[PDB]
Each structure stands twice: as C-alpha cells, then as structure tokens.
Design a protein around this ligand. Structure first.
Ligand SMILES: *[C@@H]1O[C@H](CO)[C@@H](O[C@@H]2O[C@H](CO)[C@@H](O)[C@H](O)[C@H]2NC(C)=O)[C@H](O)[C@H]1NC(C)=O
Ligand SMILES: *[C@@H]1O[C@H](CO)[C@@H](O[C@@H]2O[C@H](CO)[C@@H](O)[C@H](O)[C@H]2NC(C)=O)[C@H](O)[C@H]1NC(C)=O
Ligand SMILES: *[C@@H]1O[C@H](CO)[C@@H](O[C@@H]2O[C@H](CO)[C@@H](O)[C@H](O)[C@H]2NC(C)=O)[C@H](O)[C@H]1NC(C)=O
Ligand SMILES: *[C@@H]1O[C@H](CO)[C@@H](O[C@@H]2O[C@H](CO)[C@@H](O)[C@H](O)[C@H]2NC(C)=O)[C@H](O)[C@H]1NC(C)=O
Ligand SMILES: *[C@@H]1O[C@H](CO)[C@@H](O)[C@H](O)[C@H]1NC(C)=O
Ligand SMILES: *[C@@H]1O[C@H](CO)[C@@H](O)[C@H](O)[C@H]1NC(C)=O
Ligand SMILES: *[C@@H]1O[C@H](CO)[C@@H](O)[C@H](O)[C@H]1NC(C)=O
Ligand SMILES: *[C@@H]1O[C@H](CO)[C@@H](O)[C@H](O)[C@H]1NC(C)=O
Ligand SMILES: *[C@@H]1O[C@H](CO)[C@@H](O)[C@H](O)[C@H]1NC(C)=O
Ligand SMILES: *[C@@H]1O[C@H](CO)[C@@H](O)[C@H](O)[C@H]1NC(C)=O
Ligand SMILES: *[C@@H]1O[C@H](CO)[C@@H](O)[C@H](O)[C@H]1NC(C)=O
Ligand SMILES: *[C@@H]1O[C@H](CO)[C@@H](O)[C@H](O)[C@H]1NC(C)=O
Ligand SMILES: *[C@@H]1O[C@H](CO)[C@@H](O)[C@H](O)[C@H]1NC(C)=O
Ligand SMILES: *[C@@H]1O[C@H](CO)[C@@H](O)[C@H](O)[C@H]1NC(C)=O
Ligand SMILES: *[C@@H]1O[C@H](CO)[C@@H](O)[C@H](O)[C@H]1NC(C)=O
Ligand SMILES: *[C@@H]1O[C@H](CO)[C@@H](O)[C@H](O)[C@H]1NC(C)=O
Ligand SMILES: *[C@@H]1O[C@H](CO)[C@@H](O)[C@H](O)[C@H]1NC(C)=O
Lengths: 99, 149, 248, 427, 179
C-alpha cells in the first residue's frame, strides 16, 4: 500500500474480571406447591399468585409437575436460566375440554 | 438503588450488601491513526487524546521500544524531534505536526535499533527576510531595488 | 419513579397525573349533631374512573396542650355491600389504617373525632362476622405536617396508592390486586364536637381531582427532587416548553 | 472623522469523522455479522467524509498562501520594540515576531475573541483529553466519542494562523512596506483619502487628528465584543450549529424504529438468534438512514464554506494586501483600508472609512464655457463662486482653491448647459 | 454504484433469477422488496452526490470565465487576481474537462541596497511625492528611481505628484527647481 494516514479499528480492549452480586439465603418461591394443589379453580374464577423476593429454577418446577406443554412468548426459555426479575405473576384454571 | 440519565442508561448504583456507591463508565473505545510510509515494515501509531501509561498498561501489551507522549496523544514507533521542521509533508497529523520518514542509510547507519519515523513540525509557508533596518538611517529608509530581471 | 435517581435534568415522563388548569373540589363535610341526607348523594358521591389525586389538610387540635392530628377518612369501592370489596383509608393521630375488606357499610356513615366526642357514636359499619380482608395494614406519617398528598389509581386489576407528607411529590405506598374495577369513592363527614366557627375556628379540607395518563416534563435538581413540572398539552407555552424540553 | 467596523467571514468548520460500524453495531458480533450483508455501506460514508475533510484542508492552505504570498520583512524586526508607527498604535493587533520569542502567541484582539468561544480547535483537544475519567462525572462530547463520533484537529494550529496574520499586519508598517504599496502607512492613508475628493492641504494640516481617529477607532473595536456584537453572534452560530447536529445524530441511537427496544443489549438478552435478527435489522436500517442523511447535509454545507473562503481570499488580496479601484467591494464607499485578524473558523476584517461630520450648502456648476469656445469640467469636484470669482472645490471636503490644469479636464468645445465664463484665462 | 447490484441488503440473495425460481409468488415479493429498497436508496445517494458536485464545478467555471475576460482577453487594474503579483499577462489553452492558463510574471534576479526618501519639501514650502518610485540621492543630487528596477533619472513633472504643502517628515531640499 501507499503512503498515507489510516483509521484502524485495531485490538484495543478486553474485559478481564467479572462482577457478580446477589442477595443470599433468600427463601424459595414454592411455585410448584401452588401449581400442584388439590383445589383447582374454574376459568370463570381464575386465580393469581404473585412471587417476589425469592429463588426458583425451572428444572425442578418443570419436572415436579406433569408437563404436557410449555411455550414462551416474547421471551426464550434459555434466557430465563440466570436472570433476575422484579416479580412473577402466575395465573391458573382448569380447562373445559372442547374449548 | 439505580442512577439513570435522561436517555435511559444506568450510570451509577448503590450496593445492597455493602452500601458502597459506584459510578459506571463505558470501557474505552477508539481507533488508532496509522501513519504509514511506503515499503516499510510497520506504521507509526497515534492514539488520540490518551496518555501513554493508559496505552502501555490497559490497551497494548506487546512490547514497544519507541514511545512518547505528545500534544495529540500517545505516539508509538516514532522519535520526538519537534525542534526540527519541514515545509512539505504527506503524513499530516493535525495542529502543525507531521511524520517524516528517514532511513539509517549505509553511510551513517547504526547497529543498534532505531525508529525511522520522526514526529516533526509542519510549516508550509514563510517570509523572505532582509538584513536592513526598520528605522530611518539618518532621514532615509533602506530598501532593496532590483538591478536585473 | 420506581427505584431510579435522576440528577440535574429534565425528563419527559408519562404517568397518572392531574390535568393542569382543571378544578379541585373540597368535599370535606362536618356537623356537630345533625346529619342531612343530602350529604350522601351524587353531588358528593363521585366517580373513580382511573384514579384521583387528593390534597388533605391535617388539622392539629389541642386537648390539655396535647396535639392531635386529624382529617377525614376516604372510602373507595363499587357497590359498598358485603358481596364486594371496599377500601378504607382512615387516620388515627399518626397512624394511617388502610383496610380492603368486604364490609357491611351503613346507609349514612360518618366518623367521630375521638378527642372531643360527638353526640352520636362513630358508625360507618357493623361487622360482627370479621369479614374477608385482602389487605390490612398500618402506616405512620408526620404528625407535625400541614398537608398530605395522595395518588389513588387503578390499572389492569391492580390498585396503586402513593402518598407524601414532607413535600409535594408523592412516593409509593402500596399496591393490591383486585380483579375488579372500582367505580365510586366518597369522603366521610366527620361528626366532631368543637371544631367549628363558634369554637376555635378550624376547618376540614379534602380537595379531590381526577387523574389520567399523560406526558409531563419534570425537573430534577442536585438532590434528585422534583422542583418543577409542566403538563405538555395544557396551553401553548407548555407546548413550546415540551417541544424544546426546557423550562425557559 | 475616521470610522471603523469589523466583519467575520467563515472559512472552515469542525472536521467530523465517524466510525460507522461502531456507531451502528457498537460491540456486538451478532450485529456486525448482520451488517456485513449491506455491502460497502460504511466504506461509502467514510469516503464521503474523508473527501469533505480533504476539501477543508485545501481551503486552509489556500487562505494561508494568500496571507503569506509576497511579503518581505526585515530580520531586525522585533515586536517587543517596534509596535508603533507615525503616532498610530498597533500593539493590540500584533502577536509575537522575531528570532527570540517562541512563536506560540496571539494578539489581545484574538485573545478576546478566543476566550468567548469555548469549542475552538484547542477546546476540542482539551475536552477529549478528559474522557478517560470524565474529570467531573460526564460530558456530552465524551458520550459522542464513545459512540464513534469525533472532531479532528485542523492541519495548521491556530497559533500558526496567528503568525500569518501578524506577518501580514506588520508588512504594512516597516520599510520594505510590502503590503502598503511600497510607501509608509500614513502616506498611504493620505493618498487614499485624497482619492475620494479631499485636498492635500487639509490632510497635511490634520495629520494628528487622523492618527488619533485611527487610535480611537481601534480602541472602540477592542471594547465591543459584548453580547450583542453581530460578529461574535455570527461566530458562535457556527459552533452552536455543529453541536446541535452532532447531538441530533447521537439522539438517533435511542429511537426504536419499530423494534422492541433501542438497546442491542436488551434484545440479545431476551430473544433467540432467529428472532433477534428481525429486531436488529430494523435498528440497522434506521441508523444507516440517519447516517446517510447526515452525510448529505455535510456535503451541502461544504459548498457554502468554500464560497465564503473564496470571498475572504479575494478580500485579503484586494483590501488588505493592496487597494483595488473597485468601489463598493470592501466597505461602503469612502473606504480607506482594511486589516485582518484570526478568528475561530475564519477571519476578522477591520475596515476603516472616511466619515463626514458637518455639512455646508453650496451652489455648484458642472462645467464652464470659456472664450475661444472651449470648455472645462472639474476633476472630482465642482466649480463654485467666491467673491464673484469662479473657484474649484473637491467633492468630499469643502475647500476653495484656484482653478488650474491639475483641477480640470479641457475640451476643445463646450456643452449647451455649461455656464458662460469669459473672465477665465487664469492659473 | 455498479457494485451495489451484488449486495443482498438483508435478503437471501442478490439475483432475481435466484429468487423467482426458488420461492413462491407470495413469498418472493418479500425478498424483491428488500432488493428494490436497497437499490433505490443507493441511486438516491448517488444522485445527491452528483447534485453537490455540480455546484463546485459551476463555481470553478464562473471563475474561469472571469480569468478569460480579465486576464487573457484584457488586463484588469486589479492586483493578485491573476497570477501572484508582478503579473504581465496570461494565455489560455484547451484541456480535458477544462482550461489551462499560462501566466507570465516579472521576476527580479539581483538586488541593490539603496537609501530612499518618500517625498520632498521644496522652496515656497511646496511638496512633491514620487510617482511609483522613490527619491534617491546620487552624487549629492536628488534623483528618481522606479520601484522595480534601479535606474536614476531626473525629476520632472511626468515623474512626481505635486502638492501645495509638504508633510512634516518630507526631506528639506531647497536647491531643486528642475523641469
Ligand atoms: C391449596 O389451596 C388451599 C386454599 O385453596 C390452601 O389452604 C390454605 O392453607 C393455608 C395454610 O394451611 C391457610 O392459612 C389457608 O386459610 C387455607 N385456605 C383455605 C381456603 O382453607 C392449601 O394449603 C393449598 N395447598 C398447599 C399444599 O399449600
Ligand atoms: C431448584 O430449586 C429447588 C427448590 O425447590 C432446589 O431443591 C432444593 O435443594 C436443596 C439442596 O439440597 C435442598 O436442601 C432442598 O430441600 C431442595 N428443595 C426441594 C423442594 O427439593 C434445587 O436444588 C434447585 N435446582 C438447582 C439445579 O439448583
Ligand atoms: C446498609 O444500610 C442499611 C440501612 O438501612 C442497613 O440495613 C439495616 O440493617 C439493620 C441490621 O440490624 C436492620 O435492622 C435494618 O432493618 C436494615 N434497614 C433496612 C432498610 O433494611 C444495612 O445493614 C447496611 N449495610 C451494611 C453492610 O452496613
Ligand atoms: C392499626 O392501629 C390501630 C390503632 O393504633 C389499631 O387499633 C387498635 O387495635 C387494638 C387491638 O385490636 C384495640 O385494642 C384498640 O382499641 C384499637 N385502637 C383503635 C383506635 O381502634 C389496629 O389494631 C392496628 N392494625 C394493625 C393491622 O396493625
Ligand atoms: C523497497 O522495495 C523494493 C522493491 O519494491 C525492495 O527490493 C526493497 O527491499 C524494499 N525496501 C525495504 C527496506 O524493504
Ligand atoms: C491499567 O493497568 C494497570 C496494571 O494492569 C492497573 O493497575 C490499572 O488499574 C489499569 N487501569 C485501567 C483504567 O484499566
Ligand atoms: C519532545 O521534544 C521536545 C523538543 O524536541 C521537548 O521540548 C519535549 O519536552 C519532548 N516531549 C516529550 C514528552 O518527550
Ligand atoms: C522558509 O520556507 C521555505 C519554503 O520552501 C523553506 O524552503 C525554508 O527552509 C524555510 N525557512 C525556514 C527558516 O523555515
Ligand atoms: C547582516 O546582519 C548580520 C547580523 O547578524 C551582520 O553581521 C552582517 O554584517 C549583515 N550583512 C549585511 C550585508 O548588512
Ligand atoms: C542579467 O542576467 C543575465 C542572466 O542572469 C545576464 O546574462 C545579464 O548580463 C544580466 N544583466 C545585467 C545588466 O547584469
Ligand atoms: C446542574 O445542572 C446545570 C444544568 O446544566 C449545570 O449548569 C450545573 O453545573 C449542575 N450542577 C452541578 C453541581 O454540576
Ligand atoms: C385534662 O386535664 C383535666 C384535669 O385538669 C382532666 O380532667 C382531663 O381528663 C385531661 N384530659 C385528658 C385528655 O386526659
Ligand atoms: C353512644 O354509645 C354509648 C355506648 O353504648 C351509648 O350509651 C349511647 O347511648 C350512644 N349514643 C347514642 C346517641 O345512642
Ligand atoms: C417530620 O417529622 C420530623 C420529626 O417528627 C420533624 O422534624 C419534621 O419537621 C417533620 N416534617 C414536617 C413537614 O412536618
Ligand atoms: C372565631 O371566629 C369568630 C367569627 O367572627 C370570631 O368572632 C371569634 O372571635 C373567633 N374565635 C377565636 C377563638 O378565634
Ligand atoms: C516623523 O519623524 C519623526 C522622527 O523619525 C517621528 O518621531 C515621527 O513619528 C514621524 N511622524 C510621522 C507622521 O511620520
Ligand atoms: C480537563 O481536566 C483538567 C484536570 O485534569 C481540568 O483542569 C480542565 O478544566 C479540564 N478541561 C475541560 C475542558 O474540561
């Protein structure tokens, strides 16, 4: 190449260390004990529980309930596995078989 | 516990477990200006607006025997020679500075290593000078008139 | 805003705000002995569309040179029967008791100042059966404050309450899931004994104005305090201020 | 009296350079690998901006060549000793000149100019030196430069241009006089005031008045850069327009353009690779559209700046370095001379002007028919009557003087409305 | 501009044959639309660049028209317009996409140090000033020399401008009553 001045995006910076902060010995959210409950509502009187300031994981939950189908929307299942959230709202009811 | 700006980015935070408060800055991002003369093995490098401690610690860990600091920033692989000047330049860096290329030729070589890139001053224009006085030499002024053309 | 700090800046923020240049309404009633049936009518029984902003005067009575904070109690709901949940906010001289239960509300309810009691007893409900309560809590405020501010709004089944006693901007008090839509509110008449003009010349004030979702320009100083605000659609000068994002 | 007024002409602008891939797809390899399918989109933008900045360097060299061309100075010239000629004081106009100074200074006119403009060519270098660390907490130029947007220095320093205008100013005062038409400065002033219709007797009698009028005009220039000077307003509009366009370019990194977020970190921490691409593509299209529009506006404004630089080179060559016989080019009529000074992104010109203060009402004739059927017409003046005798007066200063061959132009016939004068066979 | 017919612009290909013979008429429209938007954007950017180049070329052509009229075809009484001062004349030639001007200048080659006066005060308290030149003092006699060549010649009326007074720093010379 010729004589001249060039603007180059060379090797400049790397991230070296990490920082990881969590708040320890928080309780468990106990989502499965509410999901696997005897008293089940109808679609006309569907029910809600809010979970906040606790721990969970989707492996134990998705193996402690009889999983028939599970599908996310505006999300992805592998993007839950390390994240924190502000709260989780779980709503439930038992299906009429035709509808 | 979070400090935002009006565009919506987080710029600081207060720790939950220690109550130690911090500000976050982005990691340094830039490009490098390379002054390259033809048929040589490597350019001369300019990191604009950076001190060479920051460059030699936090950017570039490959070894650099020639480096100095300058008004434009950190200059690698060049020699500080700003007392010298030059009237024409094809590697112009900004603010009246230039990069010159001079080989250690076989009449005056050195067996030790050298950087053939010099960081010099750029001065394209001049005045002609005359030796005459600016005051009256006894009522009259001293001037230079042409005798041949 | 929720857990954020802003410092030396304007901010364009859309929230649940009152319309600038609209009208408050002082709805606090008062009677020594008698209570009229006109006090329990759609002039005073208003609508809860999205929510209300409220500005309350904390009156500071004196018994034996002892300061007693007092104001009126507000009740939000739909039909005010025991098959429906009603929210009640009521002060207790430094303690704000907030409940949300299935009450059996009286036809002509009132509360009574407990320092200098009235001719009638306080009776806004009679509930021998201790009803279902989704929420029951006590909060503490400043007894030496002259003004208290409240935001009460609803969104997607949830009820949100904000309050302040020190300063004009409010901070978050609580939220509560309901599943229903609240449609009406009411400010109760405070049947006191000695607060009137013939007595020590005090007054009950409870100013209410509706809320809606709208954009404001907010101003934040070096302590993160909201110093200034402008409703972006109230006038032409406010259009110029929100278009330049500038208070001058 | 002698009036004096200032004029700013723009000859340059800040040289913006844009790292296009670090603006669009800052750090994320998903974005870079999506962006590589648009071909040579960032190469085109970089080449257009390099072409614009090359034009800027060519015009700066043309301005400096116009200032320096042909001036010859004495080697004994030292502006610590010599800053004054013929009772007119030039000290606030000269920088430093000589072999024993160190050429890194401006004059105090230029000091007053460069201390009301923060972001000059040295304010950008000292604002960019404080981005590793903030130096308080944060500043808008560092937020721009961390997103690939940076102003580069000009190729010549502003102290170099100050040296060029100091050499141009001192070539009018000292005895080659290479920019005062080869004659001294006060003599040149006299010949230009004589060229409008003022006789030489008046100008030799009022030499110290002319020198103090020049000193007063310069000092009234010097205390005028106060918040309503239109030259300072015109200078600061350049800097404000650049800062406004760069902030508007930075505000494009927070639009969504119909995606779920403006942030590439928020999209790549919520969606799978097949569905993150659909959202990233919208951000890429919006940011490429914004860069395209910015480059089109820069290309249109470089043509206005080149037109201004040609006007300033013409003014340097024909108002400061010489004096043209073009009326109404510099100044307004009754123009005497100009001086030049360095300003942020351009030049400041000081124009000096003849100015009448008192008037007289005279009756005048435009031609005299003398016997022999000849005619005379006055040569930049009129004919008047004084004590029933015809006399000449110049047109810009009332002073009767005898009719002579240096006053008139002769004609072998005379016009029909020339006044009859058979009494003249005079001096 | 020709190399933009090989960009995909975020579609699957850059060949319309590779889309029309590989996808469905409800589905090929989505890809052809991206190719169309890309190529139209590139054409608009080229047309903007050409519309900006023509303004610079028009400014240069107006300046060349001026140098033809005022340096070649005649000679203006300007200084530093054509050439670089000391300028005599110019000629013009045709060139690819423009014109070549050839300028001719007077160039001094050797110099002399002289002592000059800028004007003289004569008897009767009159003043003379030199007319494009200087007053030098040869053989204890004031003569005139021109500015750009050294040749002492007498003082006359075709040599000086007259004034009925003299400046305070005009050199006193009462012994002068030449032609
Ligand atoms: C399933 O839901 C029922 C209610 O529908 C839960 O019963 C509650 O149990 C708690 C703790 O023993 C009591 O405080 C509540 O009063 C009970 N509710 C009622 C309506 O009686 C039951 O605990 C749930 N199952 C599990 C395994 O937790
Ligand atoms: C997911 O969460 C469950 C909680 O339901 C974790 O299970 C607990 O594991 C600890 C570790 O021995 C036990 O002390 C608890 O008794 C467990 N709880 C239950 C309900 O079994 C589980 O470890 C988590 N999964 C992962 C991978 O960490
Ligand atoms: C950081 O400051 C907070 C201030 O509140 C501390 O939190 C308090 O800790 C005490 C421990 O006895 C609790 O009784 C309080 O209720 C806590 N306050 C709140 C608001 O939760 C916290 O301990 C401090 N951290 C450190 C490391 O000193
Ligand atoms: C909120 O505070 C009020 C007043 O401090 C409490 O009401 C008292 O409750 C006790 C026991 O139930 C009674 O003996 C008092 O007579 C009540 N006082 C009044 C003025 O009513 C109430 O219990 C508190 N509630 C909560 C949830 O803390
Ligand atoms: C310069 O180039 C020539 C051929 O292009 C080559 O032979 C020579 O070695 C080069 N110089 C150096 C120092 O490499
Ligand atoms: C630069 O590197 C040194 C040594 O590795 C380290 O101590 C220092 O903190 C670093 N500074 C920055 C700003 O990265
Ligand atoms: C660079 O060299 C100049 C003289 O050539 C000297 O004054 C200056 O201090 C030097 N700077 C550094 C950082 O070496
Ligand atoms: C002055 O400028 C000329 C231009 O070519 C250059 O050759 C010369 O070396 C310069 N002299 C000094 C002292 O800088
Ligand atoms: C030029 O000036 C120097 C002073 O540095 C002096 O020595 C020399 O004699 C001068 N030459 C002429 C021809 O005046
Ligand atoms: C002028 O210069 C030319 C060439 O340099 C020379 O031949 C000629 O003799 C000179 N004339 C005079 C008068 O010195
Ligand atoms: C607060 O913001 C204003 C607005 O720019 C600024 O002038 C001032 O310096 C800021 N205060 C501090 C302490 O930085
Ligand atoms: C105030 O004091 C009187 C006695 O002077 C007493 O009878 C009364 O009960 C007191 N009030 C209260 C609220 O204790
Ligand atoms: C108020 O309550 C008390 C306590 O039962 C009762 O004795 C009194 O009669 C009540 N007041 C009225 C007006 O009934
Ligand atoms: C809030 O209470 C504290 C102490 O109780 C007091 O110092 C302060 O003045 C009060 N503020 C208001 C606004 O009443
Ligand atoms: C209360 O107000 C009435 C109204 O006129 C006035 O007459 C009376 O003096 C006031 N009493 C007190 C204690 O302020
Ligand atoms: C005239 O000459 C004297 C002596 O050189 C000088 O002091 C004065 O300033 C000069 N004045 C003018 C108007 O040239
Ligand atoms: C840059 O930082 C220095 C301190 O290191 C400070 O004195 C100076 O004012 C800063 N300059 C700007 C333009 O902020």
């Amino acid at each position: 190449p010729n004589t001249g001045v060039y603007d180059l995006s060379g090797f400049t910076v790397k991230p070296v260390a990490t920082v990881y902060r969590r708040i320890p010995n928080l309780p468990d959210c106990d989502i499965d004990n509410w999901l696997n409950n005897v008293s089940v509502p109808s679609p006309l009187n569907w029910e809600r529980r809010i979970f906040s300031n606790c721990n969970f994981n989707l492996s134990t939950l998705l193996r402690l309930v009889h999983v028939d189908s599970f599908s996310c929307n505006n999300l992805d299942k592998s993007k839950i596995f390390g994240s924190c959230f502000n709260s989780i709202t779980v709503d439930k009811f038992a299906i009429p078989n035709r509808r | 516990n979070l400090l935002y700006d009006s565009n919506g980015n987080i710029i600081g935070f207060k720790d939950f477990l220690t109550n130690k408060t911090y500000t976050i800055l982005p990691c340094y991002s830039g490009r490098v200006s390379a002054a390259f003369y033809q048929n040589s093995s490597s350019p001369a490098l300019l990191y604009r607006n950076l001190k060479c401690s920051y460059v030699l610690n936090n950017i570039s860990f490959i070894s650099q025997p020639f480096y100095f600091d300058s008004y434009l920033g950190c200059v690698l692989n060049a020699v500080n020679l700003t007392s010298y000047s030059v009237s024409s330049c094809d590697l112009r860096m900004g603010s009246g500075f230039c990069i010159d290329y001079a080989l250690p030729s076989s009449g005056s070589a050195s067996r030790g290593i050298s950087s053939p890139y010099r960081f010099v001053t750029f001065e394209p224009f001049n005045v002609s000078f005359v030796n005459d006085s600016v005051e009256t030499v006894g009522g009259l002024f001293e001037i230079q008139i042409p005798t041949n053309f | 805003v929720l857990n954020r700090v802003y410092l030396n800046t304007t901010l364009l923020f859309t929230g649940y705000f009152p319309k600038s240049g609209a009208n408050f309404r002082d709805l606090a009633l008062k009677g020594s002995k008698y209570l009229s049936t006109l006090w329990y009518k759609p002039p005073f029984l208003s609508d809860f569309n999205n929510g209300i902003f409220s500005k309350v005067k904390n009156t500071k009575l004196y018994v034996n040179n002892t300061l007693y904070s007092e104001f009126s109690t507000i009740v939000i709901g739909s039909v005010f029967v025991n098959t429906s949940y009603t929210i009640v906010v009521q002060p207790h001289n430094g303690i704000l008791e907030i409940t949300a239960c299935q009450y059996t509300m009286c036809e002509y309810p009132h509360t009574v100042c407990k320092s200098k009691g009235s001719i009638r007893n306080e009776s806004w409900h009679i509930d021998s059966s201790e009803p279902l309560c989704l929420f029951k809590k006590n909060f503490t405020y400043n007894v030496s404050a002259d003004w208290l501010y409240f935001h009460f709004y609803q969104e997607r089944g949830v009820f949100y309450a904000y309050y302040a006693d020190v300063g004009m901007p409010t901070t978050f008090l609580f939220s509560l899931y309901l599943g229903t839509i609240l449609s009406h509110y009411y400010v109760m008449p405070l049947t006191c004994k000695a607060i009137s003009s013939n007595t020590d010349n005090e007054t009950l004030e409870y100013w209410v104005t509706p809320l809606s979702r709208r954009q404001y320009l907010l101003n934040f100083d070096e302590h993160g305090v909201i110093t200034n605000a402008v409703d972006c659609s109230s006038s032409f000068l406010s259009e110029i201020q929100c278009k330049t994002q500038s208070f001058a | 009296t002698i009036a004096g007024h200032e004029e700013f002409i723009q000859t340059s602008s800040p040289k913006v350079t844009i790292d296009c891939s670090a603006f669009v797809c800052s750090n994320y390899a998903a974005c870079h690998d999506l962006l590589s399918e648009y071909g040579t989109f960032c190469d085109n933008i970089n080449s257009i901006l390099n072409e614009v900045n090359d034009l800027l360097d060519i015009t700066q060299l043309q301005v400096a060549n116009a200032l320096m061309q042909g001036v010859t100075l004495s080697s004994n010239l030292n502006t610590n000793l010599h800053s004054d000629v013929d009772n007119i004081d030039f000290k606030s106009l000269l920088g430093c000149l000589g072999s024993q100074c160190g050429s890194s200074s401006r004059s105090l006119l230029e000091d007053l100019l460069f201390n009301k403009v923060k972001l000059s060519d040295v304010g950008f270098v000292e604002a960019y030196n404080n981005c590793t660390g903030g130096s308080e907490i944060r500043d808008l130029l560092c937020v721009q430069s961390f997103n690939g947007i940076k102003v580069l220095p000009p190729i010549l320093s502003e102290t170099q241009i100050s040296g060029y205008t100091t050499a141009a100013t001192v070539a009018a005062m000292f005895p080659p006089w290479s920019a005062a038409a080869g004659v001294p400065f006060s003599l040149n002033v006299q010949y230009r005031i004589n060229g409008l219709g003022v006789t030489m007797d008046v100008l030799n009698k009022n030499q110290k008045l002319i020198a103090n009028a020049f000193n007063k005009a310069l000092l009234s220039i010097q205390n005028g850069f106060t918040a309503t000077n239109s030259a300072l307003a015109k200078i600061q509009s350049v800097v404000n327009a650049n800062a406004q366009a760069l902030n508007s370019l930075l505000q494009q990194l927070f639009n969504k353009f119909g995606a779920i977020s403006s942030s590439l970190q928020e999209i790549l921490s919520r969606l799978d690779p097949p569905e993150a691409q659909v959202q990233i593509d919208r951000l890429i299209n919006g940011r490429l559209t914004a860069l395209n529009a910015y480059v089109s506006q820069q290309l249109s404004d470089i043509t206005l700046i080149k037109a201004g630089a040609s006007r300033a080179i013409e003014k340097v060559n024909e108002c400061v370095k010489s004096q043209s016989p073009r009326i109404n080019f510099c100044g307004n009529g009754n123009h005497i001379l100009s001086l030049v000074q360095n300003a942020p992104y351009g030049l400041l010109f000081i124009h000096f002007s003849y100015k009448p203060t008192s008037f007289k009402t005279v009756l005048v004739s435009p031609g005299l028919c003398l016997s022999g059927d000849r005619g005379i017409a006055p040569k930049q003046g009129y004919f008047i009557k004084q004590n029933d005798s015809w006399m000449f007066t110049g047109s810009s200063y009332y002073y009767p003087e005898p009719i002579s061959d240096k006053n008139v132009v002769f004609m072998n016939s005379c016009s029909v409305n020339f006044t009859k004068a058979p009494f003249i066979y005079l001096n």
